[PDB]
Design a protein around this ligand. Structure first.
Ligand SMILES: Cc1cn([C@H]2C[C@H](OP(=O)(O)O)[C@@H](COP(=O)(O)O)O2)c(=O)[nH]c1=O
Ligand SMILES: [Ca+2]
Length: 135
């Protein structure tokens, strides 16, 4: 796996970010995590959804450098969103959300599970600490 540069376009919610990648606008979805829903009427605004959204926005806007890292398998989902680990000054947003209890580990689809154990350990800590989603 390797990290590639990208420039911000707009943070959509906790786990979906529009980025300029190789000079094309693409929507990315964070691998291995789900922040609670805030757009879809079928789930409604779920608790911590808005909180997750503001956390990601904050983290990605303040970054000096944004990087994306695809995993070993599919690089897009069925909606055409890029599937990646995204880093803001070398800090993985996917992990940072999980560590705050603002996302759960989810959508673990082989072979895109390289950081699964890393993320699960951050989740276990947020749970033990009773943070946000786990409170
Ligand atoms: C993170 C991730 C999501 N998805 C798909 C599965 C879910 O589609 P369905 O909605 O059709 O089930 C959806 C979860 O995304 P959101 O959390 O943005 O809803 O995106 C993948 O296909 N692969 C991935 O790695
Ligand atoms: Ca979500």
């Amino acid at each position: 796996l390797h990290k590639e540069p990208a420039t911000l376009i707009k943070a959509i919610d906790g786990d979906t970010i529009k980025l300029m990648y190789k000079g094309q606008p693409m929507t990315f979805r964070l691998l291995l995590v789900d922040t609670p829903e805030t757009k879809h009427p079928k789930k409604g605004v779920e608790k911590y959804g808005p909180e997750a959204s503001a956390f990601t926005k904050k983290m990605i806007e303040n970054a000096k450098k944004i990087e994306i890292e695809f995993d070993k398998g599919q690089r897009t989902d069925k909606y055409g969103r890029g599937l990646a680990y995204i880093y803001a000054d070398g800090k993985m947003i996917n992990e940072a959300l999980v560590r705050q209890g603002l996302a759960k580990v989810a959508y673990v689809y082989k072979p895109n599970n390289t950081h699964e154990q890393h993320l699960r350990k951050s989740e276990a800590q947020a749970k033990k600490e009773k943070l946000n989603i786990w409170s």
